[PDB]
Every structure is written in structure tokens, then in C-alpha cells.
Design a protein around this ligand. Structure first.
Ligand SMILES: Nc1ncnc2c1ncn2[C@@H]1O[C@H](COP(=O)(O)OP(=O)(O)O)[C@@H](O)[C@H]1O
Ligand SMILES: Nc1ncnc2c1ncn2[C@@H]1O[C@H](COP(=O)(O)OP(=O)(O)O)[C@@H](O)[C@H]1O
Lengths: 202, 198
């Protein structure tokens, strides 16, 4: 059961940068084994390269509350009612950094929050047909009574919102929260909150 | 309650396509209202533009089974054990096409599955800091005993819902579309099975 082939079964022949900016778009050239027993010819694919991210679900297990951050994401404009989105604390992971270090720094910068205990949620590929981006989600213990106000640096303007867990999940169901990181984190929380609250309120 | 500002509160000054091949790399220049009052300066952002997708979770409510499709996704290589991923059926939405039409077509093309009833799951932005992509997920009723074969090189897998969900927990399924769909299924399968096996 499970997948069929490993890295022994694919060769990346070359990568060619197509666009070099803040992010990049690369052409990967590769060959790989086929399910029918053969080898592919040389395949090329365009891949959006933007590094990888740490994501923090700020959860108050005493109050059963979730902290959301609101900020504009202009890429949402063409398909969304508003480009202002309700999201998880998050940031890019630079060389040598840990997911936790980034999550804690961003919790302070984006939401004014200290974080207590932390546990992994899941690490996922955002859209692996066209981007390499991986985002690694943690849940972080917070005191939601300390979450409030306007944060961010400059080019960054972020409003904190505090909701109950059930309210946040209702917002997912209704489409008011509709970005992958937040949907994944809040679905996970709906599946795990009973044990998590028990663990963190012993 | 909820969000603070609307499209009346942002001005998109310019858009440019800086790279066009199979996909596009766009540059947006804009200014927007600030929470404390007033308007930002001009901001520029690179946006990966690839259109939008329909996704189908193939669920057999009689058997409590899901059909997964396996194919190489080279973008996964640098951060994954293998670039071959277990995924939901999916495809691009072309002009004037509906999510449902694309989902049903891709289920046949990628997995050989006829779909019965469908229901919406959720529609989500994959990574809206850097890509415009939206994906809209449906759950589709299938007979998993009909799913087999090779179907772009794609292998069809049938597993119990419980195994697919445990693979999410274990990190063996770790692409957004599948994680979202299977967590939704874990939250909703009991009512869905009742609804579809009357
Ligand atoms: N990253 C990419 N770069 C270049 N071409 C692509 C890429 N992804 C998909 N395509 C083209 O689209 C076709 C169908 O895409 P597919 O592999 O089914 O992925 P998806 O269904 O997510 O678009 C492929 O055979 C390929 O020719
Ligand atoms: N899509 C993008 N295009 C260009 N630059 C970006 C993009 N995303 C992030 N950056 C750069 O990285 C910085 C930190 O990213 P982030 O805090 O996620 O964005 P924002 O400032 O919009 O909240 C931004 O201030 C910006 O300078």
C-alpha cells in the first residue's frame, strides 16, 4: 500500500530560472519511471519557488478561543469578496531557522502574543502541481485575553480578532475563512480540541 | 463582525505580466486602507497566476472507502520523501465551465470513475500571499469497486476512509487539497453515509 516510486526512480537533469525576482519561477527538467514499467522522456515543469513557511494556530485552551489575524492579500482579489483575509499567524522560514522560532517571532510581530506550549498540527504542500511551497503548522497555547489591536511593521497592517473555537469553525463552514492554512488548522482543531484542552488544562 | 474592509478600500494601480509561459508571474501595484486610518503607500507584490481548479474527493458511502490518485509532482521533491503524491482528482476550470462539470470529467479521466451525486466541501485559496489560485472541492459518490488501473501517468488506489485519514495524520498524505478534503470527510462522513445510502 501507499506510493509506488521513490527518489531512486526520478532524475532531475537541470533547473532553469525563468523569472528571477523576489520569488522565482524555475523550469525543472526531469525523467521518471512510469506505472506501466517504462521510463518517461524528458519532462519539463514550471515551478513557483517562494521558500517555505511556519504557521501558528493561536489557541487558548482555558477559554476555548482562537486568535485570527486580518490583513490584505492582494492575490485573493480576483476570486474573493474582499482581499482582506482572516488567517493564521505565519512567516517565511529563513536558512537554519526552526518552525517554532519563526512561529514565536511572528506571533509577537503579527498579534502581540506570547506563546506557551506548542505541538505540531501538520505540514503540507500548498499546491504541488505548480509550487514547491510547504507550510508547517503548529498549535500554540495563548492567553486570548492578551490578543487585541493593530500590529505589523511599513508595508504591513494586521488586525487581531478573537473568536470562540466553535465560531471560527463556523466561519470555515460558511466560507468566511477560506485560505488553506486556516482551514487545515481549524479542521484539525475541531478533530482534536477535546484531547488538546485536556492536555493543556490538567 | 468579521473583516473590516472591502474592494472599495483598495486601489489596484497597475498589473503587469512579467513572465508568461505555461503559467504567469504577475506584478500588482496597489494601495489600501489602513486599520488606524488613511491609506498605505504604493505596494508591489509578485503573484503566481495559474488559474483556478476543481477538486473531487471520490467517496464510496457503502464501503466507507476513498479513491486516491498517485502521480509525480516534481515540485514536492525538495521537501518530501518522494515526489509521487497521493491526491484528489482535480483539474483546471476553463472559461464558462462549472466546478461540477470539471470535477466529474476529471474523475473519469484520471481514475476511470463515474460519479453519482456530488456535494460541495469548501473552496479555498491555496497560498494567497503569493498565488491567486483558488480550488473548489466537491465530494463525489462513487463505487470504489470500479476503480482501477493506470490513467500524465496516474495510478488509482482504493483505501478505507480510516486509512486515508490516518495517512493525513502520519504525513503520508500532505497536499492541501487532500488534507482539507479528508479532514472534512472525517468530520462529516457519518451523516454523508446516511444521506447517500437511503
Ligand atoms: N507545473 C507545470 N508546468 C508546466 N506544465 C504543466 C504543469 N502542471 C501541469 N502542466 C500541464 O498540464 C497538463 C495536465 O496537468 P496535470 O498533470 O493533470 O495537473 P493539474 O490537473 O493539477 O493541472 C500536464 O500534462 C502538463 O502538460
Ligand atoms: N507576493 C509577494 N511579492 C513580493 N514581495 C513579497 C510577497 N510576499 C511577501 N513579500 C515580501 O516579504 C515581506 C514579508 O511578507 P508578509 O509579512 O507575508 O507580507 P505582508 O507584508 O504583505 O504581510 C513583505 O513585506 C514583502 O516585502
Amino acid at each position: 500500500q501507499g506510493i509506488t516510486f521513490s527518489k531512486n526512480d526520478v532524475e532531475i537533469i537541470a533547473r532553469e530560472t525563468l523569472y528571477r525576482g523576489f520569488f522565482s519561477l524555475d523550469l525543472y527538467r526531469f525523467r521518471h519511471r512510469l506505472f506501466n514499467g517504462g521510463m518517461s522522456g524528458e519532462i519539463t515543469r514550471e515551478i513557483f519557488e517562494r521558500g517555505h513557511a511556519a504557521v501558528l494556530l493561536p489557541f487558548d485552551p482555558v477559554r476555548d478561543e482562537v486568535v485570527l489575524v486580518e490583513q490584505i492579500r492582494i492575490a485573493a482579489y480576483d476570486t474573493s469578496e474582499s482581499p482582506w483575509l482572516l488567517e493564521m499567524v505565519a512567516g517565511m522560514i529563513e536558512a537554519g531557522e526552526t518552525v517554532e522560532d519563526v512561529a514565536r517571532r511572528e506571533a509577537l510581530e503579527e498579534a502581540g502574543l506570547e506563546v506557551g506550549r506548542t505541538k505540531p498540527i501538520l505540514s503540507y504542500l500548498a499546491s504541488p502541481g505548480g509550487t514547491s511551497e510547504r507550510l508547517s503548522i503548529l498549535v500554540g497555547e495563548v492567553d486570548a485575553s492578551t490578543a487585541k489591536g493593530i500590529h505589523g511593521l511599513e508595508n504591513e497592517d494586521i488586525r487581531v480578532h478573537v473568536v470562540s473555537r466553535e465560531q471560527a469553525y463556523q466561519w470555515v463552514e460558511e466560507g468566511k475563512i477560506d485560505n488553506a492554512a486556516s482551514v487545515i488548522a481549524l479542521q484539525w482543531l475541531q478533530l482534536h480540541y477535546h484531547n488538546l484542552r485536556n492536555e493543556w488544562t490538567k
